[PDB]
Amino acid sequence: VETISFSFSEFEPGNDNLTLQGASLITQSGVLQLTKINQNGMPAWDSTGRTLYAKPVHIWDMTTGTVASFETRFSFSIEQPYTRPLPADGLVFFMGPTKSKPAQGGGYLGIFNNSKQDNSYQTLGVEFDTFSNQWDPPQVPHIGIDVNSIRSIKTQPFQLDNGQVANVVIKYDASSKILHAVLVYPSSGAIYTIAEIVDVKQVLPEWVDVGLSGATGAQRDAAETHDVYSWSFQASLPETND
Numbered sequence: 001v002e003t004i005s006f007s008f009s010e011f012e013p014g015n016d017n018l019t020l021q022g023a024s025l026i027t028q029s030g031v032l033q034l035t036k037i038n039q040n041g042m043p044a045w046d047s048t049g050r051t052l053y054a055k056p057v058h059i060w061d062m063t064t065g066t067v068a069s070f071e072t073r074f075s076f077s078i079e080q081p082y083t084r085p086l087p088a089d090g091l092v093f094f095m096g097p098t099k100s101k102p103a104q105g106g107g108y109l110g111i112f113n114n115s116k117q118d119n120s121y122q123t124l125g126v127e128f129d130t131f132s133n134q135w136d137p138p139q140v141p142h143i144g145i146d147v148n149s150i151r152s153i154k155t156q157p158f159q160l161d162n163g164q165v166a167n168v169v170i171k172y173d174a175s176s177k178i179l180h181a182v183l184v185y186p187s188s189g190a191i192y193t194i195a196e197i198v199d200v201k202q203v204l205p206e207w208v209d210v211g212l213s214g215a216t217g218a219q220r221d222a223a224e225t226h227d228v229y230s231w232s233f234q235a236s237l238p239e240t241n242d
């Protein structure tokens, strides 16, 4: 079994296991800030940032025809200092082609270029969307499963516990092809669950980059924080199948 796993209970500046892109920054306090925060202490608008694990992950093998099962857990907080103008856009856990660079920001969350459904994206993502774009359901925020498109195949509305820490668990079982995600707010005890069938062999390339991406709106003050406090990941690829 080909396995890979990493666990960051805290983030350390200079850690070569993580690749920071765009506005993403690791603070001295050990927090990963995906989007920029100005010196005045308020979140910056028109900011996009991503963090990728420095090594590619083997998700499926064509020779043996096996597919990896995986699980990721992370804690984040989104603080919306203002109710107006409307806060944007969110953050997302994604898997896509290796050597990927940031895509469009704003509602595309840094991983897509348009709102079209395109196989060439070869990207899977689980978003936490805070702004309702034209391709979105009216309710925000919402959890969404994105498969080669910013237009989710399935969404689940949730209530934001402003500025509080949320715990997320995303698990993929290769045997059943079920991607199930859970979001829990310890502060309020709220629990949200969402699941869908995803055939990763049909969507993703054999080796992928895994990461987190966040973005703020293009309108002045259409922003919020996208802070990550911890992140762990594990994948197991059966080397054979007899």
Ligand SMILES: [Ca+2]
Pocket: 089, 107, 129, 130, 131, 132, 133, 136
């Ligand atoms: Ca959106």
Ligand SMILES: [Mn+2]
Pocket: 127, 129, 136, 137, 142, 144, 150, 152
């Ligand atoms: Mn959405």
